[PDB]
Amino acid sequence: NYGYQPLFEDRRPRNIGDTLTIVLQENVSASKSSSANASRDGKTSFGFDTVPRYLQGL
Amino acid sequence: PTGTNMQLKNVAAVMVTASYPPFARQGQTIDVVVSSMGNAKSLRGGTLLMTPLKGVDSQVYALAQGNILVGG
Numbered sequence: 001n002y003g004y005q006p007l008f009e010d011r012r013p014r015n016i017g018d019t020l021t022i023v024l025q026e027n028v029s030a031s032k033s034s035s036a037n038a039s040r041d042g043k044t045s046f047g048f049d050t051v052p053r054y055l056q057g058l
Numbered sequence: 059p060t061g062t063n064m065q066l067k068n069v070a071a072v073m074v075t076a077s078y079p080p081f082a083r084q085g086q087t088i089d090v091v092v093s094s095m096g097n098a099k100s101l102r103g104g105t106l107l108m109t110p111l112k113g114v115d116s117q118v119y120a121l122a123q124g125n126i127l128v129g130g
Contacts, residue, residue: 008107
């Protein structure tokens with residue numbers, strides 16, 4: 001004797017020892033990315049190629 | 059077989075409702091109401107197969123099976 005068994009209810013595990021099918025379908029995909037940058041360029045110049053006479057002391 | 063086409067015409071899926079009377083004891087009988095649930099034309103002379111009547115707590119308090127009486 002197996003006890004009350006339903007007639008229209010789906011066949012589910014109910015007690016200890018009942019078997020159940022597991023469809024293993026795992027798909028995990030995690031990602032991360034990052035970046036940082038900095039730049040700085042400078043040029044300076046001053047040339048008195050021909051100095052006038054009133055400014056040759058400076 | 060899982061993959062097959064069944065196209066029935068003499069079977070209807072129904073919901074059965076009843077009242078659990080005060081001080082009801084196991085073995086007594088109660089009246090039930092049978093109502094069709096999907097696209098069924100009639101339930102004229104059908105027979106209700108073994109149906110467990112659950113409570114709010116989802117526990118079986120009655121078992122239903124009999125011949126339906128439709129006015130006509």
